[PDB]
Design a binder for this molecule. Structure first.
Ligand SMILES: Cc1cc2nc3c(=O)[nH]c(=O)nc-3n(C[C@H](O)[C@H](O)[C@H](O)COP(=O)(O)OP(=O)(O)OC[C@H]3O[C@@H](n4cnc5c(N)ncnc54)[C@H](O)[C@@H]3O)c2cc1C
Ligand code: FES
Ligand code: FES
Lengths: 1264, 49, 99, 49
């Protein structure tokens, strides 16, 4: 039984020959060429790979719909299932479907990539539940992440579907659900004609789909090493990433006996195959229909399943799977174990029945099963009268911890008949209490039981400091604090210890309906991004002879390289050749201060650095070849950590510094002196489109054309031309769009393009390659972390008088941009304060870590954070209010910065004043200490922060750009200009401008792509100035055209614009023109401390409330108001969109994102599973943004200020509001401690918060 | 005429906003553009020859 | 190009006007978004008309460069370009002609 | 021209042409053609949009 048959979007597919290893995405994407169902992690939790399975049920003869991620689902599972895709529901060449149009028109799709994913998530919801609750929609989205938008517009656009302004929701089209596409009538004709088992054969694996229970059991009995697959959410990971290969799989799953639910006398009983998603559904209602004491265990299982994971996954993974899979960190197994659950195991002639207990997991991912035994069913038990249960998980194969807890009393009293405490994440496997449990048996639920328990909890499950996972006294404390939580919430259930919005400014009254500058018009291409149709990169079709690449990389941190062995790789089917450093025919020494190598020669310098690449016919073959070439190294010593670096004296050129005053004077002249150090963590770009490069060689005279996901067009061109050894003018690079860049694609992009280029040059035919999430996070590398030490002198009014601060920056294993970053750091130590004697330095440290590069911010957001620390340490040492202190030493209109540039037209105090207004700080402040007084165990915090950001490139000669405008004989215009779209509306702003200058409707002008023979020699699409510089150029070119036309307008001044063009054409005038621009009077010198480094400044101010839970280390993000100066916005919908996005990225950088590295230097942390970026769930509860009104900026295109980066720092407020509530919990449980000065580091995670909230328990744990 | 290369046309449609790009053996670049844009019913500036 | 050396003649001219070797200038293809609104490649005048245009464009470039040639009149042509780049001049230009 | 590679999904065309010197055109019969292996569709005057 061989042919598999399924349907896609309505049409049938009959695939004669399936290989069990080809994943649904991939069939979709590259066999029936329907793009736009995107790949984002491949690992399960980014959901950009989301689609919808509809199939006919058979057991409840019903037709069911669900979501699922297609990056994970093998096609052999899909027999006789039907797939709906993004391009199934709607399209711009017909009707968009309302889920499509609303997410577009409400501003919810900037860069555009995560968009189809969210659309289907939503689409499916509606098809199950055709009028949902704002909570249910809330919540489809655990499965889906977006980077560019900060979420708000998404939910506010869809809020609409359920029960001076920005978009009209009353004009949206309405939605008639009788009009979705029909369940194919052709399955359904099947459905009678009954199943028999099927076998498919692959290139390496064999898949048997079983159909009765009898055939399962026999199969397994004669081939016991055969691997069961059901949900594939496990095996899928194992086979892809920990290169394992099980050659014979049988998948049960069809089998009625393994999918049944049953209402026993005693508990409910569920078939091993059933998905989580239906275990939930069952419980959810059978809890609400039932005497609230039988339901005590149920409430716990459901308690874990909200924070498990998210819908695309719950609808595929089985309880069966989770139970036997068996990881250290299952959240289900503790509960089932503590529950004493009830498993039904079988083989042929075997009918075992075990109660779950400490005994069931002996060792590392092992159970009691024999090889020929399969799990039949689990049974979760009703709770007896006076039996009590909770479950705990806490968050951000080892660390966190998760627990199930159970107690039973001798009836009609307190006493303790039974007790069991089971903990995930503290060992090898899921463990039990038990020594501690024993001794507590028949006491009383009272104080000295609470003590004896916590005492034993620290001894028994004590941790060595080497234990893997790290983190030790967090991991510790949690064990008690969960218990303590538990102790309390028992008591409560007897006799119970009682005491007793976004706004902006309207355009001029006067101005035209079709002048659009200043009006909030949505992103030129959101429809098409929402629809599937916009083409990103690997989205561009193959050619018929195109190869794949995939590149080989150093598994040690510093070593010589003894030799390379290619033999195991030439055995793979379709293998073409291995490219290495000996093959470049050009010059292997590239990079951008010439520090680095295109391919390593003789020695490897970090964790790894490209050694070479392999070239094959498919990308799965590409993988297996990679795998294949095996290298042999002799191992030299490693610098890693910031220190080392210094303890060794490393690093990268001579100590940078700025000075003003004298300073010897301050400090002698001063009341108090503090004196501290703090560390800021690094960070990951995580754009959704990861890097890549289709390179196509023409073959006459060295020509080659490259399609490339970059911010830097120029450079991708030259370093390709250098490496190849040919004239720049044979190379052409084009960029139509990107899934985001945030700096991460200003330089590093070249590392890939370069390799790809050569494979084409060598083999003479097109080659492409694009990174998987795991390769990309290794290779390209991060934002720079910093160590700073400081000293600051100040009066007892709070007026500051002298300050001294040292910075270092860890760089990595090539210089790159790292210098320019440090400089920008220095320009920003003042934040917004005048400060008349001041000394700031910094160093650049050489390490065997991959090279760090440019990231939104450019070092600025590192402190302004340093100072601002330091600052609230002043205000606390004085005795306060923190407001009064900052207000007190603000720059004021017309002062000068520590680099002697004048502060002209300075808005900052208007942002200040006007923020504390609306936000209403006081009274809110008062309302907070009050909650702090009345709550013992949860606390709250409040903060208000400022910011100023210099705008302009620091190398002055980068501040230029340039454009090219064609007018066709039919009236239509063709615009292109230097800079590139990363989903931030450059193009839509570039249109807006040119529409105005030329005085013809936005509708009539089109821009198509960006390229290096339309306009050469272009600056990186970079430091927020990208708008302003092309802004200018577009203008000029516009003007040269209108001069050309005057004569013909004059002679007929009431005719059409088409009229004036046919006109000039026949008279013989040019209709094509160039246009250029330079920012004038720029240039600061370092040794002279004079002259002018920026062009103007962005300003703004933020205010945040938070509340922590100082039992666990988790917090809510209660409210946040911003007020931002943008000048006279070009487009207030897209700015703002800009504001909120950046603000959320700060969220991530100060509180959520952490990278880890093995002691000897290999990055440990490589996907959405271990690197947690902020989710729909994580944005502030109320989120208020406002642009500042009446304040034109005369130094930049039609009055507007730059908007990219400045606002990202403002998240700062959430960090300090977080430092504040910490105060309040320290002062409750520390007995006293006057005016504390305590070390807090960025990023403030659950570990670090908990750790610093000192009390009873922290003290019991005291003495990778 | 009897040239050796006889006439022809690779036409490649991109699919967003009517764009199409055409590789064409011609002496007259302009016109190949407009009469394609006329027949299709779209702005000249979506066509490239 | 229909195989009649338009391109080779267009190079020859621009090599001369700019006074840099034929070897250093490349032409790759002809297209309707590099230069729009073009007459048929037709009645023998195809040489002369583009001939002219190429010239003009050539001239606008050499005017842009003068200053940097002046300040170093015995340096390389590469010398004068890195030069003007860092000082901030356009290196891309159009060019037209009518009989 | 046709020297430029295929893409991996590229179709071929080839166009149908009048076998008389002046006449009206009474109707077109497409049936014998949909039997050929790999046939995709017949384009005619009713399709230009
Ligand atoms: C995005 C994502 C998020 C996740 N979040 C969580 C989380 O929050 N908490 C958590 O605990 N886990 C989490 N997981 C794991 C997921 O819950 C498990 O993969 C799921 O429990 C497995 O069911 P399955 O159908 O995929 O098993 P499969 O992946 O098909 O294979 C699983 C195991 O079951 C086996 N098996 C053996 N006997 C049987 C039998 N009797 N019946 C059925 N299968 C059998 C197979 O050998 C295999 O090892 C997450 C996974 C993903 C990738
Ligand atoms: S789940 Fe497929 S890329 Fe994230
Ligand atoms: S719009 Fe969602 S990642 Fe860019």
């Amino acid at each position: 039984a061989d042919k598999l048959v399924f349907f896609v979007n309505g049409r049938k597919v009959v695939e004669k020959n399936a290989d069990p290893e080809t994943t649904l995405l991939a069939y979709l994407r590259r066999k029936l060429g329907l793009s736009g169902t995107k790949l984002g992690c491949g690992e399960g939790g980014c959901g950009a790979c989301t689609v919808m399975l509809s199939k006919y049920d058979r057991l409840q003869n019903k037709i069911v719909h669900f979501s699922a991620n297609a990056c994970l689902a093998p096609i052999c599972s899909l027999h006789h299932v039907a797939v709906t895709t993004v391009e199934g529901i709607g399209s711009t060449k017909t009707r968009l479907h309302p889920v499509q149009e609303r997410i577009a028109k409400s501003h919810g799709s900037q860069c555009g990539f995560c968009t189809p994913g969210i659309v289907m998530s939503m689409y499916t919801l509606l098809r199950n539940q055709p009028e949902p609750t704002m909570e249910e929609i809330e919540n489809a989205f655990q499965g889906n992440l977006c980077r560019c938008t900060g979420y708000r517009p998404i939910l506010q656009g869809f809020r609409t579907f359920a029960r001076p302004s920005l978009f009209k929701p009353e004009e949206f089209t309405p939605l008639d659900p009788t009009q979705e596409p029909i369940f194919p009538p052709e399955l359904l004709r099947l459905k009678d004609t009954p199943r028999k088992q099927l076998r498919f054969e692959g290139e390496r694996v064999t898949w048997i789909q079983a159909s009765t229970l009898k055939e399962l059991l026999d199969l397994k009995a004669q081939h016991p090493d055969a691997k069961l697959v059901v949900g594939n959410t496990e095996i899928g990971i194992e086979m892809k990433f920990k290169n394992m290969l099980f050659p014979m799989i049988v998948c049960p799953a069809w089998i009625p006996e393994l999918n049944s639910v049953e209402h026993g006398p005693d508990g409910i009983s569920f078939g091993a195959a059933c998905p989580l998603s239906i275990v939930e559904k069952t419980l959810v209602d059978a809890v609400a229909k039932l005497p609230a004491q039988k339901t005590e265990v149920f409430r716990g299982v459901l308690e874990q399943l909200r924070w498990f994971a998210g819908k695309q996954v719950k609808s595929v993974a089985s309880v069966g799977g989770n139970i036997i899979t068996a990881s250290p960190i299952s959240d289900l197994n503790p509960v089932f174990m503590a529950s004493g659950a009830k498993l039904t195991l079988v083989s042929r002639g075997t009918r075992r029945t075990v109660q779950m207990d400490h005994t069931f997991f002996p060792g590392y991912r092992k159970t009691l099963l024999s090889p020929e035994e399969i799990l039949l069913s689990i049974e979760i038990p009703y709770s007896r009268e006076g039996e009590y249960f909770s479950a705990f998980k806490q968050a951000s194969d080892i660390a966190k911890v998760t627990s199930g807890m159970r107690v039973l009393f001798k009836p009609g009293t307190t006493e303790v008949q039974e007790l069991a405490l089971c903990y995930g994440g503290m060992a090898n496997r899921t463990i039990s209490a038990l020594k501690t449990t024993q001794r507590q048996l028949s006491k009383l639920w009272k104080e000295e039981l609470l003590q004896d328990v916590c005492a034993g909890l620290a001894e028994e499950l004590h941790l060595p400091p080497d234990a893997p996972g790290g983190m030790v006294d967090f991991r510790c404390t949690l064990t008690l604090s969960f218990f303590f939580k538990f102790y309390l919430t028992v008591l409560q259930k007897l006799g119970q210890e009682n005491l007793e919005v976004q706004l902006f400014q309207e355009v001029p009254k006067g101005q035209s309906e079709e002048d659009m500058v200043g009006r909030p018009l949505p992103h030129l291409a959101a429809d098409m991004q929402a629809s599937g149709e916009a083409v990103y990169c690997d989205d561009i079709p193959r050619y018929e002879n195109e190869l794949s690449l995939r590149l080989v990389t150093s598994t040690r941190a510093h070593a010589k390289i003894k030799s390379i062995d290619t033999s195991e790789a030439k055995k793979v089917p379709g293998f073409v050749c291995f490219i290495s450093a000996d093959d470049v025919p050009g010059s292997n020494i590239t990079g951008i201060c010439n520090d680095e190598t295109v391919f390593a020669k003789d020695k490897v310098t970090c964790v790894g650095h490209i050694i070479g690449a392999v070239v094959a016919d498919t990308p799965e073959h590409t993988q297996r070849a990679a795998q294949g070439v095996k290298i042999t190294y002799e191992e030299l010593p490693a610098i890693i950590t910031i220190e080392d670096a210094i303890k060794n004296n490393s690093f990268y050129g001579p100590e940078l510094k700025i000075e003003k005053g004298d300073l010897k004077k301050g400090f002698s002249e001063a009341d108090n002196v503090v004196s501290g150090e703090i560390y800021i963590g690094g960070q990951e770009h995580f754009y959704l489109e990861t890097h890549c490069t289709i390179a196509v060689p023409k073959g006459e005279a060295g020509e080659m054309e490259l399609f490339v996901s970059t911010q830097n067009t120029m450079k991708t061109q030259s370093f390709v031309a250098k490496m190849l050894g040919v004239p720049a003018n044979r190379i052409v690079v084009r960029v139509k769009r990107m899934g985001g860049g945030f700096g991460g694609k200003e330089t590093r992009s070249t590392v890939v393009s370069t390799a790809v280029a050569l494979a084409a040059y060598k083999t003479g035919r097109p080659v492409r390659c694009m990174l998987d999430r795991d390769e990309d996070m290794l290779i390209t590398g991060g934002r720079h972390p910093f160590l700073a030490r400081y000293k600051v002198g100040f009066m007892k009014t709070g007026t500051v008088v002298a300050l001294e601060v040292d910075h270092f920056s860890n760089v990595g294993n090539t210089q790159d941009l790292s210098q320019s970053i440090m400089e920008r750091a220095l320009f920003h130590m003042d934040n917004c304060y005048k400060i008349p004697n001041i000394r700031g330095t910094g160093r650049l440290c050489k390490t065997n870590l991959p090279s760090n590069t440019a990231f939104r911010g450019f070092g600025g957001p590192q402190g302004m954070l340093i100072a601002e620390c330091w600052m609230s340490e002043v205000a606390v040492t004085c005795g306060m209010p923190a407001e009064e202190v900052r207000r007190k030493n603000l720059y004021k209109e017309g002062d000068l910065t520590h680099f002697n540039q004048k502060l002209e037209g300075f808005t900052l105090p208007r942002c200040w004043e006007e923020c504390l207004a609306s936000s209403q700080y006081h009274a809110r402040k008062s309302e907070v200490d009050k909650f702090n007084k009345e709550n013992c165990w949860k606390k709250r915090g409040l903060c208000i922060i400022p910011t100023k950001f210099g705008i302009s490139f620091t190398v002055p000669f980068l501040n230029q750009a340039g454009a090219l405008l064609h007018v066709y004989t039919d009236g239509s215009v063709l615009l292109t200009h230097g800079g590139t779209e990363m989903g931030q509306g450059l193009h839509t702003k570039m249109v807006q401008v040119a529409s105005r200058a030329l005085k013809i409707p936005t509708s009539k002008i089109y821009i198509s792509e960006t390229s290096t023979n339309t306009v050469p020699n272009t600056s990186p699409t970079a430091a927020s100035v990208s708008a302003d510089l092309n802004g200018q150029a577009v203008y000029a070119a516009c003007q040269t055209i209108l001069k050309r036309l005057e004569p013909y307008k004059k002679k007929n001044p009431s005719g059409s614009w088409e009229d004036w063009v046919t006109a000039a054409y026949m008279d013989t005038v040019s209709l094509s023109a160039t246009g250029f621009y330079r920012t004038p009077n720029l240039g600061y010198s370092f040794e002279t401390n004079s002259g002018n480094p920026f062009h103007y400044f962005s300003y703004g101010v933020a205010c945040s409330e938070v509340e922590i839970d100082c039992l666990t280390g988790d917090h809510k993000n209660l409210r946040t108001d911003i007020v931002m100066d943008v000048g006279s916005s070009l487009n207030p919908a897209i700015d703002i969109g800009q504001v909120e996005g950046a603000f959320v990225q700060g969220l991530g950088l100060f509180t959520l994102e952490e990278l880890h590295y093995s002691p000897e230097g290999s990055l440990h942390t490589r996907g959405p599973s271990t690197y947690k970026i902020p989710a729909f769930g994580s944005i502030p509860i109320e989120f208020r943004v406002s642009l500042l009104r009446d304040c034109p900026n005369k130094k930049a295109i039609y009055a507007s200020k730059a908007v990219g980066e400045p606002p990202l720092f403002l998240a700062a407020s959430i960090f300090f509001a977080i430092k504040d509530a910490i105060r309040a919990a320290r002062a409750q449980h520390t007995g006293n401690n006057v005016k504390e000065l305590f070390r807090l580091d960025s990023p403030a995670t659950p570990e670090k918060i908990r750790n610093a909230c000192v009390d009873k328990f922290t003290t019991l744990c005291v003495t990778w």
